[PDB]
Structure 1
């Protein structure tokens, strides 16, 4: 219509003030005058409301209330007055007016409410159809992470959501820029259809659409699954000392499932490699494990994920594999050659040390895709040459960039224009270098170079542009055609130690190639296995192992005294082994068992805390070693923690005052001057003594002799009198 609004305007413009304002206030300046006010933000709203709710007319309502409801109700209550609220034409009304309206006012229809407020109603749906398992009690470290908080988002940026909401709610006010993406367009169609004829305030529609469309996150202490449908009920599923097992109603994302499958498979592989029979152990865990009560076996049967650990599990189960990995949404299959993982430091174009892994060796790569394909060659941080094809030039673009990133070349390293987030958590390096060069090739292409390709009337070229050129191109870039048999899944076999070979006997995958990254599952994994602690996670491997030792201490102690080697070999210590760097397991064991023998040998120097502390490190065939250790390294979420041999550390300490052992900050309960189990082949006697010569490091005790007592900087600022023992202890 537009009938009454223009009449109003006419009316207003009759008035001189209003005409002046309307004629001398630009659209920009309207933003200022819209907020012009004498009213201030209430500094104590709780008090003010308590005060005002005692008053007859504390509520301010549109003046039209006066024609919409009676002045008084059946009971004699005045419902509205003609007093203008300060600064507006709203009037002062009673709360009785709100109730009146709610019993006797104009009934509306609410067909759009579920659709506009879908984000909210969906929460209730997921709960109404959720299932509760039981409550378990235990201590678990809840690590603070950024996590998603709104299920059902469309993964739009704030720009793209704005653009979409403008098209949906206010199409004629869009301006010049209209929607690129097909994701944007298909959302626009749907929403336009769902919300047609909608008479709810477009403010609420836009507000809700914005909340719903944009992925929002938050930093929270979270122990379990990090998916948004789990985050949403964190208050219900997780307490300080408890877990309420629960499954929300509705379907999981395929992305969350895939991600969890990879985490599960890696955990299983990593646990299995440290068992006496890895394949037997992996198969066992494959057959007992579930993700959200789905058997892992079924998932592995029907899930297309190609990943090293996943493929090891598939191999074990007789499932055919595609011996490929994904990178940036494109499937990669190495044709010929191989390379080597190497940890080295890299100065980028930002001017930044960032020391993640490199691939170093000859590797031919066939790369399938959505609408594109290519034949990338790679040496050591080299793009030996990438011939790319596709339906559109566009589809050749995405993959073009992806492949320059993937090369690891110095020309893309020194071409970027940080390595962590704000919480200082390390981020994905060879995926972020892609994200950057995604929305800005500019520098890369004009810092890559060009090439003068021969007439060879077939192999075209792409320039530092996107343009096509005849007998020039980028450094090692081509545009040709070629690329069904890439997707064919092959039958493989797998040996006791998880080596995967094709039917011709060629090595496809080895457990050591499996990424060492300890991720966090988006969905709950239940191993249901005697080989895995009931409580998942590396922190929990630590707390559970020590908790278990302590609670079984009487048995374990007598086993320590009578039958050491059986104790060392117990299966409960194998998960803990996965936290110890592979290269240290044997020497750490050797060191530990020797210290334990010295404790046995030198009577009256028993120490239960020292035994408990070091015991897990005994669980590996020991090697002979000279090396003295002041600490053992554990790797917890990609970061070394050091457990000190002598006394308390941040990782493991005994607190006198509580009389409890605290492990990564969690209590796991509790069970002469001579220390028999700190140095191999020495005793600590007590306080250092100037009347026994100067202070040596540990690594200078080297050349002492039986009976010969020194002063040592033993650790954490202490100096102690040691003595090289007269006899030895053997293992």
Structure 2
């Protein structure tokens, strides 16, 4: 309106100048961003000091003038000053004032009709509060804690997105007139945008603040922290008030935020479709991609496309890995050998060929790596740090808490390193039928021995016996492991160390673009395998809710 005309007059006056004209004529609009920095540049070393030195003054604050006149804010209300007509040097349209005036505003100032919109602006923090209120605390106890360090998420968030997907969403919810071309994420996620817009429409608000809050509402704060007990964002947000190095405030927090259910459902779906595509023999790749794009699922209220969620999550499972590989989705440098988890710390190597006789004389090729390497390993409630050297398990240390888990981790580690005589001369029990090729698809002896172990516990015991056994020397009694998985014995296994206290999980902010074969075996710029279809449960029946398998 008249304001519009005033803006036009100001633009004209400004163009009358020469420098302003040159700068508003040359180049594109992006230069604006640059111009935003050369101006209003001033910092301070110890703001605390200068704040105590300024608030000791009469008028340490600036403020708008017309807003006060329109608000009828007087001066010298009860012999106490609030402001005086002046012009700050920087703004030139602001006037000095005192802190007391703010209280005046809060007490006898202009009131808006409603302000419940705030609860939507800062929904994350009200959610924190509510989650807290729905807790049932418990007794307090003192003891030592095995706090392991690791990378986790501290902010529960639904529909975790990227940044490119968020920047457009803010514009389409607040500044639509200034909106860019419609991106795919919008056309796909229409109802979401409609919801976010229904709330922040026809309201008196500062919009920059809203955009910042939305960024926080869609950011899972990832941190490398010490942790104990279960791992859930609902806990990590207040971990500080659950336990430390010497104390623990017990409390039950299981029935809140319904997060891990979504992840387990996703992984189940991935397993299902992976098996389906494996049923094929020559196009399992395209079959899997079709099954992917021909599928969707519901999240809370909205329906999202599978391929979209898969590229946003970070569940390092041998199922999600394959999918993210088919879709060309980059991922981290994390391995998987059956149920266990692995991560390489250092070392190198290269493939090498060798053979073994299954029964009598039956040559079967099996490969290994010819060098020294170091690996971290994590099984259920058990950690380990070991090294392989030329088809042998050089050393290993463990910091778990269970005997069964310890033994299983040790066995899977020995297998991963092809250590022992079994890889030199397999047992009689195995045969050519159990070898491979359920229907033609071969199987390396590694996973063969894997399933052979999972079959019977006695295979596992024999495998452990394959490792050298000796008499527990003095002093090392505590750092020793028997066959049952006991922290001490009179005779223990060879080249083993135990200790109380998990191992600190390594960290690396790296990404890699890998591929896979027609047999669903991924490769990473080398002959190394990061995932497959033999490392997942065989099969199981489940009834998926709120899903769409729109495929014949």
Q: TM-score category by the smaller chain? A: 0.5 to 0.7
**CA deviation vs aligned residue, 1:288-347 (integer Å, no higher than 9, x gap):** xxxxxxxxxxxxxxxxx69xxxxxxxxxxxxxxxxxx84637445xxxxxxxxxxxxxxx
SS in 2 for 1:84: coil
- Contact 1:84/1:91 (CA < 8 Å) preserved in 2? yes
SS in 1 for 2:215: helix
Partner of 1:54: 56
1:631 corresponds, among 469, 476, 495, to 495
- Contact 2:152/2:224 (CA < 8 Å) preserved in 1? yes
Alignment of 1:127-526 (within 5 A): 127-180=132-185, 184-248=189-253, 251-253=256-258, 255-257=259-261, 326=268, 328=270, 330-332=272-274, 365=275, 367=276, 376-378=279-281, 395=294, 431-432=320-321, 434-439=323-328, 515-517=339-341
Distance 1:573 1:27, change over 3 A: closer
1:538 corresponds, among 382, 385, 395, to 382
Rounded to whole Å, the distance in 1 between the matches of 2:262 and 2:40 is 56
**CA deviation vs aligned residue, 1:488-533 (integer Å, no higher than 9, x gap):** xxxxxxxxxxxxxxxxxxxxxxxxx9723499xxxxxxxxxxxxxx
- Contact 1:129/1:249 (CA < 8 Å) preserved in 2? no
Rounded to whole Å, the distance in 1 between the matches of 2:272 and 2:36 is 51
SS in 2 for 1:30: helix
Gapped regions of structure 2 (runs ≥ 5): 297-305, 308-313, 331-336, 344-379, 385-396, 412-459, 505-552
Rounded to whole Å, the distance in 2 between the matches of 1:385 and 1:544 is 39
- Contact 2:242/2:250 (CA < 8 Å) preserved in 1? yes
Rounded to whole Å, the distance in 2 between the matches of 1:46 and 1:76 is 29
Rounded to whole Å, the distance in 2 between the matches of 1:39 and 1:181 is 37
- Contact 1:146/1:220 (CA < 8 Å) preserved in 2? yes
Partner of 1:591: 469
**Is 1:83 matched with 2:86?**
yes
Distance 1:214 1:589, change over 3 A: closer
SS in 2 for 1:164: helix
1:41 corresponds, among 40, 43, 65, to 43
Paired residue total: 378
Question: Could you tell me the TM-score, scaled by structure 1's length?
Answer: 0.44
- Contact 1:148/1:218 (CA < 8 Å) preserved in 2? yes
Rounded to whole Å, the distance in 1 between the matches of 2:155 and 2:186 is 22
Rounded to whole Å, the distance in 1 between the matches of 2:159 and 2:280 is 36
Partner of 2:476: 610
Which fold has the larger relative contact order, with Cα–Cα distance below 8 Å and residues 6 or more apart in sequence?
Answer: 2
Rounded to whole Å, the distance in 2 between the matches of 1:101 and 1:175 is 39
Rounded to whole Å, the distance in 2 between the matches of 1:223 and 1:140 is 7
Alignment of 1:693-712 (within 5 A): none
* Rg larger in structure: 1
**CA deviation vs aligned residue, 1:601-635 (integer Å, no higher than 9, x gap):** xxxxxx5x433333x425379xxxxx996621xxx
Question: What is the Cα deviation at residue 116 of structure 1?
Answer: 1.4
Question: What is the Cα deviation at residue 256 of structure 1?
Answer: 0.6
- Contact 1:154/1:214 (CA < 8 Å) preserved in 2? no
Question: What is the Cα deviation at residue 21 of structure 1?
Answer: 2.2
Partner of 2:31: 29
Rounded to whole Å, the distance in 2 between the matches of 1:433 and 1:82 is 69
Question: What is the Cα deviation at residue 215 of structure 1?
Answer: 3.5
Rounded to whole Å, the distance in 2 between the matches of 1:158 and 1:59 is 36
- Contact 1:577/1:617 (CA < 8 Å) preserved in 2? no
Gapped regions of structure 1 (runs ≥ 5): 263-304, 307-324, 333-364, 368-373, 404-420, 442-512, 520-535, 546-571, 597-606, 622-626, 633-642, 644-650, 653-661, 667-731
- Contact 2:148/2:503 (CA < 8 Å) preserved in 1? no
Rounded to whole Å, the distance in 1 between the matches of 2:293 and 2:171 is 27
SS in 2 for 1:145: strand
Distance 1:429 1:94, change over 3 A: same
Rounded to whole Å, the distance in 2 between the matches of 1:75 and 1:385 is 80
2:115 corresponds, among 110, 123, 126, to 110
Question: What is the Cα deviation at residue 573 of structure 1?
Answer: 5.3
Question: What is the Cα deviation at residue 158 of structure 1?
Answer: 0.7
Query: How well do the aligned residues superpose, as a CA RMSD in angstroms?
Result: 4.5
